[PDB]
Design a protein around this ligand. Structure first.
Ligand SMILES: CC(C)=CCC/C(C)=C/CC/C(C)=C/CCN(C)CCOP(=O)(O)OP(=O)(O)O
Ligand SMILES: [Zn+2]
Lengths: 314, 346, 6
């Protein structure tokens, strides 16, 4: 109702509807630490919040008071909890609360309390119809917002809304193939639907990734996905992969590719392959290429990897 | 350039004093701001510029003690501040009942942590009540919530639980088997650790996971050598000059600690490039007001000032104590805690 | 600008 910045705003201490309540002040004792100074309005709203809270008053006036408390500080988790208690006690329209929280989150998309509040509401309503579109809007202000992706995965999993996610992922990867959050989402969808054990799917994915790598060779995300879906089945079990990569080396080279190769060679040594002593040298040669010219910032790491390979396969 | 040590000491001093209303959104977590300042002064060996006794009393006034009837055990621990309006009580008289007063896992952690840094012996801490409250926060999947009334749950709070159990030297505060399960399940296909299963791996959650295991002394037992090598690879790939928290994200000063400390725990921080990391951190130093920011030419804050200093510590900066990479206190403080634990065992 | 961790 009465906005905090309305010309006719009145302190709670001066409102008739609140005459029967004694405000409760905050006290940090004799020597306060990390004390925050508050304005008259701020201290006034919270002095009454403390009062209502202390008496667990489930009133309509208390419900309206929380709106002000939240405008002053949306990071106060106790205020949000009490508001939820009131939403239930007064049996408020939850569809209306959804509009409220939708606006709040847009203004503060990195606040933990507001995302938690929306999740509780959706659980109460058992209605996810607005979620995917809402999140897509938030992801438009920041495509990597961890809170947004977290909420999106919860919704999809909880109400089994996998049907269009793989398509949404394809669309976003076209907007920015370097968004690590989207590659994670792709793995999320697939492993929770078809899985990767279906050779047809694995091939589709490995092919898809090699295509993205060809478009932007220097992309850790794409390389991590590729290695991710193959590392547990065994990198050395894919002979055509080793050659297809060695063929990219000329043009589409990058430290990520060289690293992948080193990892392939190591898988071979791990599985007692043919030419043990020769493979080990092909690896060491790459490790040094990484250290001296391809990924110099990790010079000492790559040399440490090399020394590890030698003392393990000789 | 160079490290402006005295400037940073004054910065932390100011934090412990008074803040502008524009910091009102930190009200419920003032205790962690205090931690950043105190632990920060400890790291610079300047705790002498504060009145340890006054601050210890303030901290104890934040403890949610069990009431006469002990019907609120599941809600004990520490508050982030006095925003609820409960009358000042430095853990002297018994707990005063209140429908919504209870602890917050991150505050119980930073609270105990502050007490140890200040030299207190935790004698006024109701250890059993805190552990009871901690147990109540754990979920079926092994992770934790921050408050008994309910909140989001993830790796951040698993780390808090671990630190609390470690400091009180008693792991009855959690079901370690379930927690370890949660940590394992958070490992991503790219080998980093995420906030939870299926989520994008992140520098912050990777630190929380690895540090929690090290505190339980089960790193080796939970991850295989092959697994640890993959985790190490993911972590060391985070260095661009300074460190970022996720692939393809811009570097941020605080990750010099989040990731740097993880690498230290995995014993390969020594293989990173020190100069570029140090240069980046210093480039975010505010030469006028002190402290550090997340990016260069950006306003400083207590969080980045503290973590930037701990990041420098990892490389043994001239003038900064060695930080205990898993407990998040100075090694000097971790040593005092070792003595405290020994003394109890009598 | 900042890092909200809670
Ligand atoms: C008080 C204390 C020392 C607590 C330790 C336990 C905790 C809470 C650790 C938090 C670690 C951490 C850095 C979590 C990530 C925080 N975010 C900023 C998450 C989502 O927002 P984004 O802007 O997408 O984050 P970013 O891009 O920085 O990863
Ligand atoms: Zn940061």
């Amino acid at each position: 109702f009465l906005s905090l910045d309305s010309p006719t705003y009145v302190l709670y201490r001066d409102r008739a509807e609140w005459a029967d309540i004694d405000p409760v002040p905050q006290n940090d004792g004799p020597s306060p630490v990390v004390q925050i100074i508050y304005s008259e309005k701020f201290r006034d709203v919270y002095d009454y919040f403390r009062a209502v809270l202390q008496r667990d008053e489930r009133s309509e006036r208390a419900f309206k008071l929380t709106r002000d408390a939240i405008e002053l500080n949306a990071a106060n988790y106790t205020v949000w909890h009490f508001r939820r208690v009131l939403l239930r006690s007064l049996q408020k329209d939850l569809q209306e609360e959804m509009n409220y929280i939708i606006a709040i989150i847009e203004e503060q998309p990195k606040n933990y309390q507001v995302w938690h509040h929306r999740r509780v509401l959706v659980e109460w309503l058992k209605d996810p119809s607005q979620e995917l579109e809402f999140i897509a809007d938030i992801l438009n202000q920041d495509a990597k917002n961890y809170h947004a992706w977290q909420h999106r995965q919860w919704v999809i999993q909880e109400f089994r809304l996998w049907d269009n996610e793989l398509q949404y992922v394809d669309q976003l990867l076209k907007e920015d193939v370097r968004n690590n959050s989207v590659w994670n989402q792709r793995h999320f969808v697939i492993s929770n639907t078809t899985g990767y054990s279906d050779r047809a799917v694995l091939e589709r994915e490995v092919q898809y990734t090699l295509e993205m790598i060809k478009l932007v060779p220097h992309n850790e995300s794409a390389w991590n996905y590729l290695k991710g879906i193959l590392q547990d089945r065994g990198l050395s079990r894919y002979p055509n992969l080793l050659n297809q990569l060695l063929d990219l080396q000329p043009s589409h080279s990058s430290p990520y590719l060289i690293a992948f190769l080193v990892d392939i060679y190591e898988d071979m040594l791990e599985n007692q392959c043919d030419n043990k002593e020769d493979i080990l040298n092909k690896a060491l040669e790459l490790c040094e290429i990484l250290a001296k010219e391809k990924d110099t910032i990790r010079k000492e790491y790559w040399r440490y990897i090399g020394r590890s390979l030698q003392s393990k396969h000789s | 350039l160079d490290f402006l040590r005295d400037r940073h000491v004054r910065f932390f001093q100011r934090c412990l004093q008074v803040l502008p209303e524009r910091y009102s959104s930190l009200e419920t977590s003032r205790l962690t701001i205090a931690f950043f300042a105190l632990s920060g002064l400890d790291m610079l060996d300047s705790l002498d510029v504060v009145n340890k006794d006054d601050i210890i009393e303030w901290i104890y006034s934040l403890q949610v003690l069990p009431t006469e009837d002990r019907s609120n055990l599941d809600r004990c621990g520490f508050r982030g501040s006095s925003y609820l309006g409960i009358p000042f009580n430095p853990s002297k008289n018994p707990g005063t009942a209140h429908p919504y007063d209870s602890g917050h896992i991150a505050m119980t952690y930073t609270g105990l942590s502050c007490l140890i840094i200040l030299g207190d012996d935790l004698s006024r801490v109701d250890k059993e009540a805190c552990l009871a409250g901690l147990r109540a926060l754990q979920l079926e999947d092994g992770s934790f919530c921050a408050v008994p009334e309910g909140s989001e749950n993830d790796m951040r709070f698993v780390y808090c639980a671990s630190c609390i159990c470690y400091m009180l030297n008693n792991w009855s505060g959690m079901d370690m088997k379930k927690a370890i399960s949660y940590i394992r399940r958070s490992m991503s296909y790219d080998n980093g650790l995420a906030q939870g299963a299926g989520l994008e791996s992140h520098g912050g959650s990777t630190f929380c996971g690895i540090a929690s295991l090290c505190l339980m002394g089960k790193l080796e037992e939970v991850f295989s050598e092959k697994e640890l090598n993959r985790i190490k690879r993911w972590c060391i790939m985070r260095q661009q000059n300074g460190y970022h928290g996720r692939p393809n994200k811009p570097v941020d000063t605080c990750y010099s600690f989040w990731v740097g400390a993880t690498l230290k725990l995995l014993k390969i921080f020594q293989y990173t490039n020190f100069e570029k990391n140090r240069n980046y951190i210093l480039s975010t130093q505010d030469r006028l007001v002190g402290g550090f920011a997340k990016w260069p030419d950006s306003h400083p804050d207590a969080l980045h000032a503290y973590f930037g200093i701990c990041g420098l510590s990892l490389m043994e900066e001239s003038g900064i104590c060695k930080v205990h990479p898993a407990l998040n206190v100075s090694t000097r403080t971790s040593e005092r805690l070792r003595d405290l634990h020994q003394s109890w065992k009598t | 600008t900042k890092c909200v961790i809670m």
